[PDB]
């Protein structure tokens, strides 16, 4: 995934359709989602457990 995804401060819709479940972490890969204050739509598709 791009490492600059969280630098898009004007992003409105985010569509993740991968597998965010990494090794024994609470989805640390998307821990930068708090940066996007303009986010309106989120479409995670990664077979979430928690």
């Amino acid at each position, epitope marked *: 995934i791009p*490492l*600059w995804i*969280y*630098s898009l401060k004007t992003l409105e819709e985010l569509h993740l359709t991968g597998n965010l479940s*990494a*090794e*024994n*972490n*609470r989805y*640390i890969v998307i*821990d*930068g989602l*708090r*940066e996007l*204050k303009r986010l309106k739509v989120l479409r995670l598709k990664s077979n979430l457990s928690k």
Partner: nanobody, 120 residues
Framework: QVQLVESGGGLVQAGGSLRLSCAASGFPVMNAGMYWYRQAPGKEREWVAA????????YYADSVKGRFTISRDNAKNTVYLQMNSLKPEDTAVYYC??????????????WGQGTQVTVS
């Protein structure tokens, strides 16, 4: 240049209070999101503390929620994290992290060297 360096690492038996710190170079800390991650032997990096830019709102994981205090000081251009009698099971190597500062070059996330705090 952009780099993170932290201090305050020291083995402390349960019953005291430790004060952490950091040091950000090349960018203001006010207009940037700072993060605290913990590293353990045989365990991956776990998020601990996050302070949101443009509004100064603190975010804590349920593992350590309601137990620490994190603040940003622009006078020293650093972030202070203070613990409250951290448990022996909380011993970890804390990592500083700030990602996507106003400057946008190839390194998008910056980490510190890492300080080991021991509790027994």
């Amino acid at each position: 240049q952009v780099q993170l360096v932290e201090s305050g690492g020291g083995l402390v038996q349960a019953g005291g209070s430790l004060r952490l710190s950091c040091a950000a170079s090349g960018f203001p800390v006010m207009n940037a999101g700072m993060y605290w991650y913990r590293q353990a032997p045989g365990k991956e990096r776990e998020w601990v503390a996050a302070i949101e830019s443009e509004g100064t709102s603190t975010y804590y994981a349920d593992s350590v929620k309601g137990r620490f205090t994190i603040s940003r000081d622009n006078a020293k251009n650093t972030v202070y994290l203070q613990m409250n009698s951290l448990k022996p099971e909380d011993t970890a190597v804390y990592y500083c992290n700030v990602k996507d500062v106003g400057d946008n070059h190839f390194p998008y996330d910056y980490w510190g060297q890492g300080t080991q705090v021991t509790v027994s």
